[PDB]
Design a binder for this molecule. Sequence first.
Ligand code: FES
Lengths: 135, 48, 100, 225, 26, 86, 14
Amino acid sequence: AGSRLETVGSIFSRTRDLVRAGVLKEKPLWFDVYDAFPPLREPVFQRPRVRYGKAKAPIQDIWYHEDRIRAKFYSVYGSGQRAFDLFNPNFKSTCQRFVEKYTELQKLGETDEEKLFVETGKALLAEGVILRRVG
Amino acid sequence: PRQRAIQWGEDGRPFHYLFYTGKQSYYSLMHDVYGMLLNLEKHQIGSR
Amino acid sequence: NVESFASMLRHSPLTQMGPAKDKLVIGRIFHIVENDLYIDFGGKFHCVCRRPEVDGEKYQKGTRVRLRLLDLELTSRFLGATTDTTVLEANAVLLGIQES
Amino acid sequence: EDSTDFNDKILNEPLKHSDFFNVKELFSVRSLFDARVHLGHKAGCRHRFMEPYIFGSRLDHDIIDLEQTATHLQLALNFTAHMAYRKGIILFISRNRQFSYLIENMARDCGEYAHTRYFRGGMLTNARLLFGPTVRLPDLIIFLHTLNNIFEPHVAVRDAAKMNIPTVGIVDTNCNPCLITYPVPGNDDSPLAVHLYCRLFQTAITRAKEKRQQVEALYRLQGQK
Amino acid sequence: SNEDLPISMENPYKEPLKKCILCGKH
Amino acid sequence: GKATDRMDAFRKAKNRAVHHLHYIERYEDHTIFHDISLRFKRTHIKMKKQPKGYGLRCHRAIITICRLIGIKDMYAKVSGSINMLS
Amino acid sequence: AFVIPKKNVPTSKR
Ligand code: FES
């Protein structure tokens, strides 16, 4: 027979219950596999509601402390002529190159951004970089 | 009238991988002609 | 130890890019109809551009080109809609061919 | 008594092992990440039932949590292999026209089925009238894209539930997973991701179909002795 | 716990708020 | 079941129902587990779990459906609208 | 039990 009430329970509960009742004489081919390895959430129909009032989505924004440095570099110098290669999983850009230097010099113990930035900008020029500070 | 041959065996499995489209023949042809065009890219009157 | 997914996220070339607006990236032409060049740049969506008349013959399937990213996904919500209407492509400007 | 031997050696034996087909070796979080499976839609497209699976939003682009994708992906692959081993009809359903050729090829290669075309009304709920009274319906349906071309759930997702057919589904951040038996949160737009799912479900099916043969040969050796 | 998790910050890429030409002028 | 002839609507309604079967859990296979107070649209049903022998003391449509489920002892009062379909 | 007249739906020999 079967129950086409896709909104009442799940295919498992519905099947399980019809077998117990005696309607479904034969367990469907998938039943034993599901029973052994059930999914993390039972597939039960739910109606999507709107969030009224103060309800917000719990999804947070992914920020990392390196982002502050990236922003500053983009504000001062901007995206260099270097073209991002997103295909290479280990690609490093001049921005992150700049960031790494900044981050490494912070390990020494410097707590001042002004002095640190002037150093980092010139420490990356010691490595040989193309930067434009005015634009 | 020409009739379509039985499309599944005793076990019940259909013989064509496009059975459940309802039009295995039409979509098989459409699948083929599409591929022939695809390969060509990899390589590079009186009739009605 | 197997890198945590979070670890991968930090050091992915996409995360360090930050905002995508006005970022030069390298794309690969993977499909062409007429003059429409479909260019995958290394994100969730492709970016259809148009064959530049300067050197049209040189923009062929597989060619690597320099793009100017404007948006990773063209979406917008319109009056009375409950979700955004996504076009399912990115916005970028085709500058030219990458030369080694 | 053939029922006891046949049932135990074939049907009940594989269901007694945690990973009878070793599908966990087919993918890794590094492999998923390199296929851009973590890339979701923008935050203005999000479905609220896909929130549990979203790690966060990176500049208003939802990042799918690959840690849960891996646990879900294994569960989906494990089910697929067990069904392929049990001689189940597996249908691959999609409407993403960019990958209709790929998915139709993949279905033929693993000896299974594909519906990548306009889904006519009643294929599942009215199959004995659309095909014939003795037609056998799929035992498993794999959705590689769960939204139709107007960005809404494929009608088959609901019709599979009405017909009591389990489903496996790739569910992006804008999709509705409430009725999918085995949702696998991951990107369903990037060719790298879609190629990976096809590679994984092909292997899982192929491997499961061989092992069904490579455990009835043992039945032959055991039958003689 | 772990140190590689997203830090709860405010958006550092936030652009300066657009002011009209006559902003601050009597 | 909708049709122009009664007998054609009995068929459709009868045969379509067996494809839409619920399973109603029963306490001791004669009553319900707890008491149910539900409002479907504008129809209110206040159902009471009772002991054995009580019988079905409920609206004539509920006794019919209860006999088809297997519930043998229950009380229910219908308030609000009493649309057979609600 | 009310026995409804069984209609010969498949009159037309297909
Ligand atoms: S922006 Fe209008 S007065 Fe400040």
